[PDB]
Ligand binder design. Structure first.
Ligand SMILES: c1ccc(CNc2cncc(-c3ccc4[nH]nc(NCCN5CCOCC5)c4c3)c2)cc1
Ligand SMILES: c1ccc(CNc2cncc(-c3ccc4[nH]nc(NCCN5CCOCC5)c4c3)c2)cc1
Lengths: 94, 91
């Protein structure tokens, strides 16, 4: 108890889409959440190479959820997993 | 406004298996929440081709994420989470 622009998503070889994550009893209110565009990965010709995997990369973030519910003064410190982007990986059996 | 508050990168393998692999640097701080923050650092500037060699005509770039940090004062820092492989703006 304590009192208190980027263009990679569309250029990647593992491009991703971006989603909003709304919750009014939470600070920050909206979080951009990435979603891998492809299963495989874009090759030199710009087609999908299914020999490779687009995989979402995640980050643990702290978030303040209002408690009691819908309270502008009291919050609970939470941890949620948020996909921030996609990388291209070799499958474990390549 | 003053307010009242109640109080994967250790198990993932994409970092060593990516075409834009990355390094991890651990930041321990006792006077912070989170105490521990792993910051990703692109291994190469180029990307890895089929033969495990670096293609310097593609770019490893770090993906950033704004996260909340408590010191109490609530702060926002940018943390590199991993690296993706991008076509340079002129390819
Ligand atoms: C290391 C790492 C990766 C590789 C191979 N991987 C790769 C290499 N070099 C460029 C791209 C690459 C990446 C992203 C793209 N997006 N669009 C691209 N090309 C336009 C396609 N369009 C389709 C629709 O018709 C209009 C044209 C396009 C190309 C991908 C080699 C070595
Ligand atoms: C879409 C996106 C990207 C591409 C090209 N990008 C790529 C494709 N497929 C595998 C790797 C990749 C990634 C990481 C690795 N680490 N080691 C690798 N290969 C070791 C090879 N051996 C060296 C010693 O001689 C025997 C052979 C190795 C390969 C990289 C194509 C299409």
């Amino acid at each position: 108890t304590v009192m208190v622009s980027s263009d990679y998503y569309n250029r990647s070889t593992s491009p991703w889409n971006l989603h909003r994550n709304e919750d009014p009893e939470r600070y920050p209110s909206v979080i951009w959440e990435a979603k891998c565009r492809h299963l495989g990965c874009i090759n030199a010709d710009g087609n999908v190479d299914y020999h490779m995997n687009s995989v979402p990369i995640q980050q643990e973030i702290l978030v303040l959820r209002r408690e009691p519910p819908h309270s502008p003064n009291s919050f609970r410190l939470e941890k949620i997993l948020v996909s921030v982007g996609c990388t291209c990986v070799t499958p474990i059996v390549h």
